[PDB]
Design a protein around this ligand. Structure first.
Ligand SMILES: CC1=N[C@H](C(=O)O)CCN1
Length: 271
């Protein structure tokens, strides 16, 4: 039975279910979901411990700056290449090419706030930063490399008050005027659904966050038919598609298993 890890994100659950169903459609392997993994660190430790055989969703800039303890590379291709080579060298883990989307931190505001405050870029926030409330996830404030400390030293300012919360809550918090700005995830469907504005990262502070599955070479060796299944999804999901899938769960309240199934059926399980 292949143990598939899902991080505590709607996106991770959708993709974990998608992998599970594709594996069972194509092969005689049974699968199990290991859900609610709190962070990439928890995912990685679970893989080191053999608690999971597959990480459904890992993000290049995230593991680059934490797991690998490296500078935040700003080029998508170079960042992916470093992560892939390092995962092979250090762990004999295969970090696959991307599904096709980058899920980045994105400073997000209502269009009303942007018009009132004259905001197009992250640097535009500087003039009144002390007046703003910023909603962020439960980890970003303490992250090294791509975290708040790095943000401050690059952009040269702090927000008046920063509020860490479950990432799922930031979209309503900003829509409802509770926060002036939130550090959202760019693949969340509620950004488009709520007509929000993503601010340009004008100093290119954030590294890329291309999303890929990760699987130990040992697992791929034990189950030679596994790589071919995973290959079917590589390059097949762009951001717009990911946003739509995310919204199926977060806006329409559908089970990730159901959303995954419907996606696979539409694409005839990629043959
Ligand atoms: C920028 C980003 N952060 C998440 C995290 O830090 O695990 C993963 C998906 N996107």
């Amino acid at each position: 039975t292949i143990k598939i890890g899902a991080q505590s994100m709607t996106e991770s659950e959708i993709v974990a279910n998608m992998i599970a169903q594709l594996i069972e459609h194509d092969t005689d392997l049974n699968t199990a979901l290991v859900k609610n993994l709190g962070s990439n660190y928890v995912q990685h430790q679970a893989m080191l411990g053999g608690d999971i055989d597959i990480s459904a969703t890992r993000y290049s800039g995230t593991d680059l700056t934490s797991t690998l303890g490296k500078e935040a590379e700003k080029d998508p291709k170079k960042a992916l290449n470093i992560v892939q080579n390092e995962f092979q060298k250090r762990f004999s883990y295969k970090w696959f090419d991307s599904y096709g989307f980058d899920n980045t931190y994105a400073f997000t505001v209502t269009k009303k706030f942007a018009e009132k405050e004259h905001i197009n870029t992250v640097s535009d926030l500087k003039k009144n930063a002390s007046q703003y409330k910023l909603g962020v996830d439960n980890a970003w404030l303490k992250r090294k490399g791509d975290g708040y400390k790095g943000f401050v030293s690059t952009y040269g300012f702090e927000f008046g008050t920063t509020y860490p919360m479950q990432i799922g809550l930031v979209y309503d918090a900003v829509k409802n005027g509770k926060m002036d700005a939130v550090l959202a995830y760019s693949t969340d469907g509620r950004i488009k659904a709520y007509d929000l504005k993503i601010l340009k990262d004008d100093k290119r502070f954030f590294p890329p966050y291309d999303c890929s599955p990760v699987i130990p070479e040992k697992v791929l060796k034990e189950h030679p038919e596994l790589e071919g299944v995973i290959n079917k999804l590589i390059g097949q999901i762009d951001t717009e598609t990911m946003q739509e899938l995310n919204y199926e769960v977060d806006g329409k309240l559908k089970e990730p298993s159901v959303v995954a199934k419907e996606f696979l059926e539409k694409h005839h399980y990629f043959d």
